[PDB]
Ligand binder design. Structure first.
Ligand SMILES: Cc1ccc(-n2nc(C(C)(C)C)cc2NC(=O)Nc2ccc(-n3cnc4c(N)ncnc43)cc2)cc1
Length: 271
């Protein structure tokens, strides 16, 4: 996974990161055609403890290879340490959906749900629990291709859930009841979150339970209330989302079933 720095053309800064600026750039690969990349830099990785914390991201990402999961391209372990990932040129899914609300067809929305279900069926095959399935963790490579990633300070921390609570940023509005009540995160709770993520896509990047306090969400869910059917959502798609939201995790579908059903809904929409 080691990359030669001279083969990277470092472009503009596209964001801030916990360890240093994140830039876009070009990787003039010796084996593959030139590719656009996102480059995470690390200002203090000359320190072994800082370097190990920063590189945890490369260690996690290196395990996976799927067309709808952000790919790790490589690492430069000589100072300054860089992590090189594929660039998703169209950026965050939420802003993309908001800007193109009147331009995107329903078929494109279902296609994004379908592509994410393939990424999640793949992670479930590896017995990997994502823990934060939400539109904030999805990037857009093109108008017909989205990619699942993961972002946030809590990912670098030893006690990830504890950090979120300290700042009151636990994603209660996306979480399965067993994750809220017992801090249980499984393939079934990822399914619950995926249902909320499909709702966000159909709602064109609107957040769930807007204007509702976190403490009140728990009560509503326990009482059987669920996010409403988005406008223009096919009834079969809503039925699928309501199955993701079964209070009992054993009644929820698995991602292989979600993928097969989303493929059928997409085919029917396009027809
Ligand atoms: C500590 C830690 C932090 C994150 C992870 N973790 N886990 C996953 C799964 C599990 C989904 C493989 C993925 C990740 N990372 C990213 O997605 N990074 C990640 C970093 C930059 C970009 N990136 C690509 N294009 C852009 C762009 N236009 N703007 C901003 N960032 C971009 C995309 C992904 C793991 C550990």
């Amino acid at each position: 996974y080691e990359i030669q720095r001279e083969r990277i053309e470092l472009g503009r800064c596209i964001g801030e990161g916990q360890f240093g600026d994140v830039h876009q750039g070009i990787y003039m690969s010796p084996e593959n055609p030139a590719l656009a990349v996102a480059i995470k830099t690390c200002k203090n990785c000359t320190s072994d403890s800082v370097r190990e914390k920063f590189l945890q991201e490369a260690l996690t990402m290196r395990q996976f290879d799927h067309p709808h999961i952000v790919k790790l391209i490589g690492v430069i372990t000589e100072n300054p340490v860089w992590i090189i990932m594929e660039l998703c040129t169209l950026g965050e899914l939420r802003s993309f959906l908001q800007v193109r609300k009147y331009s995107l067809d329903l078929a494109s929305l279902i296609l994004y749900a379908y592509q994410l279900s393939t990424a999640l069926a793949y992670l479930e095959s590896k017995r990997f629990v994502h823990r934060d399935i939400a539109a904030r963790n999805v990037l857009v490579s093109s108008n017909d291709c989205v990619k699942l990633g993961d972002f946030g300070l809590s990912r670098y921390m030893e006690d990830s859930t504890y950090y979120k609570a300290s700042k009151g940023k636990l994603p209660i509005k996306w979480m399965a009841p067993e994750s809220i009540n017992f801090r249980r995160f499984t393939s079934a709770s990822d399914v619950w979150m995926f249902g909320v993520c499909m709702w966000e896509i159909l709602m064109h990047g609107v957040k769930p339970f807007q204007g509702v306090k976190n403490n009140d969400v728990i009560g509503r869910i326990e009482n059987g209330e669920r996010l409403p059917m988005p406008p223009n959502c096919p009834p079969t798609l809503y039925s699928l989302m309501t199955k993701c939201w079964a209070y009992d995790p054993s009644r929820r579908p698995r991602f292989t079933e979600l993928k097969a059903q989303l493929s059928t809904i997409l085919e029917e929409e396009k027809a």
